């Protein structure tokens, strides 16, 4: 029942090979709906979901204008951060920013976030009150001082608590077929001998949406966390997700092992058995 809107931005410098690469994507929950790529021909914010295509020319012009402004700010950032960290131009560096809002079952605001990373590590983030900052090291303290003096948090909070939530509701209504669905996992387990004395048991979940899911193995009711290989939830490419978890067990012991599947689409969590 709960929902989120998030925007993800990546800028990468490329020493002596021109301007930095800038990519922006927007999601509602686990469904992407817009992109911008600085290297592409169009130089436009572009639709990536059917239900956003109906937005009119003012939306696309304004979103293109705003995303280019974001691009330019991150361009400047890569130079500023090299100065903050006393880094040279021999190497490529990466800035990432992500922000957005969560709402619960009733579509009321839960929480907002606005986070920045440099070279894969936290740099600065708005705290949960949306009134103050968490700066991860001394260079980020410089940014904190500047963003406090410029009252950045107040502008962000107004967006995250208000504007962000309003667009999320709009998207949820316009894309209701896609966005307000839940596809329960189709589940099964597979068994394959790896030798005359051991077998791999793999628990599958297919064709589910949203992506959040939990798959766990038990042996006589005891969790087998340290012995489980759990892969990252992966897209099928049709708007649904897949995931598996495996254990390697002594042949003959299969009936001790059970797979447990939890997903919001299931009316009850499933236990799959070998008997």
């Amino acid at each position: 029942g709960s929902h989120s809107m998030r925007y993800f931005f990546t800028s990468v410098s490329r020493p002596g090979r021109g301007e930095p690469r800038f990519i922006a994507v927007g999601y509602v929950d686990d469904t992407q709906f817009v992109r911008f790529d600085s290297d592409a021909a169009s130089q436009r914010m572009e639709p990536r979901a059917p239900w956003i295509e109906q937005e009119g020319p003012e939306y696309w012009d304004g979103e293109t204008r705003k995303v280019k402004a974001h691009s330019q700010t991150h361009r400047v950032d890569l130079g500023t951060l090299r100065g903050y960290y006393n880094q040279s131009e021999a190497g490529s560096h990466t800035v990432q920013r992500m922000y957005g809002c969560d709402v619960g079952s009733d579509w009321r605001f839960l929480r907002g976030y606005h986070q920045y990373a440099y070279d894969g590590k936290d740099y600065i983030a708005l705290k949960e009150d949306l009134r103050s900052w968490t700066a991860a090291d001394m260079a980020a303290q410089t940014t904190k001082h500047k963003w406090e003096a410029a009252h950045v948090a107040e502008q962000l909070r107004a967006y995250l608590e208000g504007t962000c939530v309003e667009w999320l509701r709009r998207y949820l209504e316009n894309g209701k077929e896609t966005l307000q669905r839940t596809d329960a996992p189709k589940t099964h387990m597979t068994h394959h001998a790896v030798s005359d004395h051991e077998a791999t048991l793999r628990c599958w979940a297919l064709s589910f949406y949203p992506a959040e899911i939990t798959l766990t193995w038990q042996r006589d009711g005891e969790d087998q966390t340290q012995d489980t290989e759990l892969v990252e939830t992966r897209p099928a490419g049709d708007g649904t997700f897949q995931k598996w978890a495996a254990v390697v067990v002594p042949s003959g012991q299969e009936q001790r092992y059970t797979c447990h599947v939890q997903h919001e689409g299931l009316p009850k969590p499933l236990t799959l058995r070998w008997e």
């Binding site: 925007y7 939306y59 700010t73 950032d77 920013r97 500047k146 950045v152 967006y159 995250l160 667009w167």
Partner: peptide, 9 residues
């Protein structure tokens, strides 16, 4: 839709 208020670090 995107935010505004995005300042340089």
């Amino acid at each position: 839709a995107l935010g505004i208020g995005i300042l340089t670090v």
